[PDB]
Design goal:
Two copies of one chain form a homodimer. By secondary structure, chain A is α/β, with parallel strands linked by helices. Chain A has two domains: 136 residues, Alpha-Beta Complex (Aspartate Aminotransferase, domain 1), CATH 3.90.1150; 249 residues, 3-Layer(aba) Sandwich (Aspartate Aminotransferase, domain 2), CATH 3.40.640. Chain A has twelve helices and 13 strands. In chain A, strands 2-10-9-8-5-3-4 form a seven-stranded mixed β-sheet, sandwiched between helices. Chain A has a two-stranded parallel ribbon with strand order 1-12. A two-stranded antiparallel ribbon of chain A has the order 6-7. In chain A, a hairpin with a 4-residue loop joins strand 6 and strand 7. In chain A, helix 11 packs across helix 12. Chains A and B meet through helix 1, helix 2, helix 3, helix 4 and helix 9 of A and helix 1, helix 2, helix 3, helix 4 and helix 9 of B. Chains A, B: Homodimer. Chains A, B: Its EC number is 2.6.1.44.
């Protein structure tokens, strides 16, 4: 009995996980409480204690999103999974969707929507700006879409998209509104119900500081109605809102087996959400906004130029122009090798054009703002001609 | 400024996670080494230390699968994600796929394949049995599929499907072979390359005893070639083999951003795989087989009747007929309340018909076999006249 592949020598070595200050746009440093929780024993996916944790997570997501939507749950996937599921459930072949493009996330959503068979339309913001209400209105009228997709915090450009009045306008025109809040939730105001948003998701690893890989999502009654009027089943069983909603106790029905939830990620997310709810939205968002203001003053005093329009900045991800002659990758490497602090480059349209400093969760403190200002300045100075 | 939803009282309570003996068909009890690892700090998804862990995981899955396939990686999803991704990448609209049905997993794969737009054909085994090579050959001849899907260990029926010669037969007929090994890997012989299997996945939470939520997958050259000849984009970016493969360093291209991998699940999976590789496949699979033999002797001496044909038993999941007059749910509840031990009922076609006892990873020991025998016998005796 012969085995051509042998046990890997590499696995005989210890697992190495250096403890870094993650000042990029995510993931952010996990609270010790969330790391401790993830050593708890595994539970069965349909055990009452598991369902209890899921139930408590639902209440916490409803708080953070400011929604009473019964269709509120989490997806067993990273943040892209929120984008996937929201598009997969709410689009059928040939449906017209309008993507409000304020950065990379417009490109990614357009990609997924085309993969799902939709007729994709795009309205693009001015450079470093959000879309105005007029620009959104004009595009809605022209395209007559059934779905509008916006990214509240575009982490590629560091742009915060305003949302007041947008859902109301969508609803005047038989259109659903889907909003990505992965980078923005906790760092900017969000009122899902008040702003008439129909589908929304966030990430676990950004402001929350939970492990990556589980993503809160919510659907309005209008979005559930759209699902009910589908003529064919959604393309992916794994994302089907009715079936995961049932697993999460959302609708009339018995809890049945859909898939095995990761109790580990449930534990970390539950603790992260508990911490956020205890701080409370007003304090949480003020903290991120206030840290961002401190970061701007420090950057601008040092002669750096910010990428986003001043009226349009997202507190949690700050895009800063790469100065004349500096090799951004070399600057990042200097910071990592000398201090174990992460400073990031750009994404999508800003690739190679910017640095991105994230101020999220455990890292949105005056101490950590001052630390990243210090090391960023040193790293840039180290590599500059 | 007005918060209609208030911070949930429930999240002010302690997180509660009882330590149970999970002797159902999964998840299995995590090694302490894997639980400990999941308290490690979060890393960036593209940091060298993260890519190193991913590289080491790849070597370990190549070992456990017995493959040298370059297209070997993990999906950021539970076991169903392996099924989703293998179908999503290898099927285009109208492709004929044959499902070899040996239990529930035949129904679930037929479902996903129809959602993805395939022309789905099914051949069903005899009750409690695997498919014979003749039955497979006859079905291939009738349907002339471009893909055949089999489940090596069907955890609903406790049936091990024989695979010798089927990939070779498929290839004689211009057909790819996809095999689910979520329940069987580590508990039954598997040689992916030797058996000419084109796509295969396993679960993290079964024999391996890692947390649920990340799934090892591999694709042969023939499968990669099928992918390259597609004339349509795969429907889900999140599962796209080329993009996930690039993130995992498979195809000689630059690593780029696809999605944020879960550090935490990597750590747990890495340690679980390291432990399995240390033991080695010969001893690992013999341990599961020997524990199952012990369980069968204990069950049969006690007068219980096994569901699966003696020639077709899967070591890791043992289906036992529910005796006349026993309420299986009540027996399960009795065992949980009295001993914090999990015993499960059926799944899909065996729902309400069987108990299922899992012998997986940390729980495939003589001590735990003896414990589950004691508790099962007591629980059944408790609810029976």
């Amino acid at each position: 009995m012969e085995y051509k592949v042998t046990p890997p020598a590499v696995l005989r070595e210890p697992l190495v996980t250096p403890n870094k200050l993650l000042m990029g746009p995510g993931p952010s440093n996990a609270p010790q409480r969330v790391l401790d929780a993830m050593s708890r024993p595994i539970l069965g996916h349909l055990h009452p204690e598991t369902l209890k944790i899921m139930d408590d997570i639902k209440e916490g997501v409803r708080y953070l999103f400011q929604t009473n939507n019964i269709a509120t749950f989490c997806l067993s996937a990273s943040g892209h999974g929120g984008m996937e599921a929201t598009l997969c459930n709410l689009l059928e072949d040939g449906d017209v969707i309008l993507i409000g493009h304020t950065g990379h996330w417009g490109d990614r959503s357009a990609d997924m929507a085309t993969r799902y068979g939709a007729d994709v339309r795009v309205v693009k913001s001015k450079v470093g700006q959000s879309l105005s209400l007029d620009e959104i209105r004009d595009a809605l009228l022209i395209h007559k879409p059934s779905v509008l997709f916006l990214t509240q915090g575009d982490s590629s450009t560091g742009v915060l998209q305003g949302l007041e009045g947008v859902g109301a306008l969508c609803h005047q025109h038989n259109c659903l509104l889907i909003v990505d809040t992965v980078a923005s939730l906790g760092g900017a105001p969000m009122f899902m119900d008040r702003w008439e948003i129909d589908a929304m998701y966030t990430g676990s690893q950004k402001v929350l500081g939970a492990p990556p890989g589980i993503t809160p999502v919510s659907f309005s009654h209008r979005a559930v109605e759209r699902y009910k009027r589908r003529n064919t089943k959604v393309k992916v069983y794994y994302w089907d809102m009715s079936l995961v909603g049932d697993y999460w106790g959302c609708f009339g029905r018995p809890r049945i087996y859909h898939h095995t939830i990761s109790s580990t990620l449930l534990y970390g997310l539950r603790e992260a959400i508990a911490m956020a709810c205890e701080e409370g939205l007003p304090a949480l968002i003020a903290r991120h906004e206030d840290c961002a203001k401190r970061l701007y003053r420090g950057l601008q005093d040092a002669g750096f130029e910010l990428y986003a329009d001043p009226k349009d900045r997202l507190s949690t991800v700050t895009t800063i122009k790469v100065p004349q002659g500096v090799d951004w990758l070399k600057a990042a490497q200097y910071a990592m090798k000398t201090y174990l602090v992460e400073i990031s480059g750009g994404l999508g349209p800003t690739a190679g054009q910017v640095f991105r400093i994230g101020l999220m969760g455990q890292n949105a403190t005056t101490e950590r703002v001052d630390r990243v200002l210090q090391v960023f300045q040193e790293a840039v100075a180290a590599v500059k001609p």
